[PDB]
């Protein structure tokens, strides 16, 4: 049941890096304290996405064995997993890091900004769906690492090296599932199942981003999202 010393080192690295930085309270505070129409919704989206890129690059760099991959493979995993890792981090903030009742207010403001709801409703539905699994901080951080270290990506040259990197993380997650949800043997499969919904967001991310454009993304965001 218990994590061995090697598994503890992997988990310490992931947990320390995941919780090192926090999304500034003032970015989320602008939504309720300042005018929030389509234009402000677009600008705040850009600031938040920029924060995700800054956090996830730092996190990805501290992933056990990530630096055993060549620079081109490192970039491919970063770009390949970006959308999925962003939604997982947003889901954790939305579900567990906001003041009581603020998640409903932030949802209200986005739904009333003017931006098309085509991709907004499935995003909030995803947050609600993962929110019912009552995930721990460990589970969110490990799922994020597992998403990044996916050997399935369109672009990855050394798939077997990535598979070997992801394997011990899946093992840690399986152990954590057994320790905290012993009554539910399918908990591990349920967690992983929620990643298929993220893959669809990733697959259609260019159309989704298009739907959020107000009459323009920053250079860093254009690079990570291929837009």
């Amino acid at each position: 049941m218990e994590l061995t010393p090697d598994q503890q080192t992997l988990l310490h690295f992931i947990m320390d890096s995941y919780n090192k930085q926090r999304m500034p309270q003032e970015i989320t505070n602008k939504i309720l304290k300042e005018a929030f129409s389509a234009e402000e919704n677009f600008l705040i989206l850009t600031e938040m996405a920029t924060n995700h890129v800054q956090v996830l690059v730092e996190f990805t760099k501290k992933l056990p064995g990530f630096q055993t991959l060549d620079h081109e493979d490192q970039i491919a995993l970063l770009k390949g997993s970006a959308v999925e890792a962003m939604f997982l981090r947003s889901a954790e903030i939305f579900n567990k890091k906001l003041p009581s009742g603020h998640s409903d207010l932030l949802e209200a403001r986005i739904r009333n900004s003017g931006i098309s709801d085509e991709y907004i409703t499935p995003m909030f539905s995803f947050y609600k769906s993962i929110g019912e699994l009552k995930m721990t901080q460990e589970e969110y951080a490990l799922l994020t690492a597992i998403v990044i270290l996916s050997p399935d990506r369109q672009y990855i040259k050394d798939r077997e090296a990535v598979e070997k990197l992801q394997e011990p993380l899946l093992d840690v997650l399986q152990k954590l599932c057994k320790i905290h949800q012993p009554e539910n043997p399918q908990h591990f499969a349920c967690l992983l199942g929620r990643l298929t919904e993220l893959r669809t967001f990733n697959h259609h991310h260019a159309e989704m981003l298009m739907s959020w454009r107000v009459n323009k993304f920053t250079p860093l965001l254009c690079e990570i999202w291929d837009v």
Binding site: V57, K61, K62, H71, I75, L78, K79, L220, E223
Partner: peptide
């Protein structure tokens, strides 16, 4: 080099 490469390769 790209912005992503500059950030990824920046020594920790």
């Amino acid at each position: 080099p790209s912005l992503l490469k500059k950030l990824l390769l920046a020594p920790a």
